Design an enzyme around this catalytic site. Structure first.
Site, PDB file in Angstrom:
ATOM      1  N   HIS A  68       0.848  -1.216   0.000  1.00 57.47           N
ATOM      2  CA  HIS A  68       0.000   0.000   0.000  1.00 57.47           C
ATOM      3  C   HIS A  68       0.872   1.251   0.000  1.00 57.47           C
ATOM      4  CE1 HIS A  68      -3.443  -2.684   0.946  1.00 57.47           C
ATOM      5  NE2 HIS A  68      -4.054  -1.790   0.167  1.00 57.47           N
ATOM      6  N   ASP A 217      -8.034  -0.372  -8.579  1.00 57.46           N
ATOM      7  CA  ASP A 217      -7.455  -0.808  -7.297  1.00 57.46           C
ATOM      8  C   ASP A 217      -7.018  -2.262  -7.401  1.00 57.46           C
ATOM      9  OD1 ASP A 217      -6.465  -0.133  -4.864  1.00 57.46           O
ATOM     10  OD2 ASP A 217      -8.220  -0.802  -3.799  1.00 57.46           O
TER      11      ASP A 217
END
Ligand SMILES: Cc1nc2c(N3CCCC3)cc(Cl)nn2c1C
Ligand SMILES: [Mg+2]
Ligand SMILES: [Zn+2]
Length: 313
Positions: A68, A217
């Site tokens: 992330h 994503d």
């Protein structure tokens, strides 16, 4: 004013494709992103000096976690670029402006833990935001950076255009809460299959932009197999850390996050591609036909996970 960002030939060509990997040279990612805005939006969507200062503040507010991270931010933004370029006429000047920024910002200040872990640890952020905890924090970090002196890239917009773009970015970032994806996709399935789906209906556009955000994503499942397989490492490295921290709180984590059950990864990829990814890119291709490459690559990589299980790699 006359300063076109250009890329080496291979990148110039490969960047247009859905499966583009942005490479291991961190120092080129900002120029990749500016290039993408200029071709997506225009050479004049943003004052270059403000854009650059925003990009470097956004970068600084991503953490050195395995997955992330800033590389993720730019990877998701490039997938959004591929979608917007293969569907030129379906999106407003403002949606093109807001969605690339939305994607760059969408995981701002992420620490490598699920909303679930914040709730069980009882993190302050879980008291401030009861649902979509990290995602409300990501949007909140975007606004903070947008209000730093010389960082308002939206300065030239009207009062109402500015409010529209910040609302596009808020819904775009909330939609990356995969807890919301499931209902959003089921509603989009139903609406397209009965013919009710209408792109002049603002609440329908919202759902479609929501689904694009899940797709961008999850775009690590749509890469060439060696990229997909190596990102899976970075992905599992966070899950197993979060599993460790669940055990520290006196909780058996789901097997996905349990680093003792590494053996079960191939089957967990199966579950994920069947439960999440394939349905996502299936529904997306129905709504937006030119995005089929995402579905085809996702299918190819599912087939590659099946092969890992059958001991053929
Ligand atoms: C991009 C990607 N995302 C996930 C994921 N999650 C999404 C966020 C929460 C769970 C789970 C699994 Cl098992 N694989 N996976 C991959 C490959
Ligand atoms: Mg996120
Ligand atoms: Zn993300």
């Amino acid at each position: 004013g006359l300063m076109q960002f250009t890329l080496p030939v291979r990148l110039c060509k490969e960047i247009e494709l859905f499966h583009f990997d942005i490479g291991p040279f961190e120092n080129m990612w900002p120029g990749i992103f500016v290039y993408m805005v200029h071709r997506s939006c225009g050479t004049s969507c943003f004052e270059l000096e403000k854009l650059c200062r925003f990009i470097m503040s956004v970068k600084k507010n991503y953490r050195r976690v395995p997955y992330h991270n800033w590389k993720h931010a730019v990877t998701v933004a490039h997938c959004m670029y591929a979608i917007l370029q293969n569907n030129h006429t379906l999106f407003t000047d403002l949606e093109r402006k807001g969605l690339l920024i939305a994607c760059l910002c969408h995981d701002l200040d992420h620490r490598g833990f699920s909303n679930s872990y914040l709730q069980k640890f009882d993190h302050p952020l879980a008291a401030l935001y009861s649902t979509s905890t990290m995602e409300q924090h990501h949007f909140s970090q975007t606004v903070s950076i947008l209000q730093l002196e010389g960082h308002n890239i939206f300065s030239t917009l009207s009062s109402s255009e500015y409010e529209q773009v910040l609302e596009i970015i808020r819904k775009a970032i909330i939609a990356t809460d995969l807890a919301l994806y499931f209902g959003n996709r089921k509603q989009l399935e139903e609406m397209y299959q009965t013919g009710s789906l209408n792109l002049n209906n603002q609440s329908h556009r919202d759902r479609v932009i929501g689904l694009m955000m899940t797709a961008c994503d999850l775009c690590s499942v749509t890469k060439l197999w060696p990229v997909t397989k190596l990102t899976a490492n970075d992905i599992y490295a966070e899950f197993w850390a979060e599993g460790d921290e669940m055990k520290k709180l006196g909780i058996q984590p789901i097997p996905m996050m349990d680093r003792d059950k590494k053996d079960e990864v191939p089957q967990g990829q199966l579950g994920f591609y069947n439960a999440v990814a394939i349905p996502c890119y299936t529904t997306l291709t129905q709504i937006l036909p030119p995005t089929e490459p995402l579905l085809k690559a996702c299918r190819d990589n599912l087939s590659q996970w099946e092969k890992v299980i059958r001991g053929e790699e």
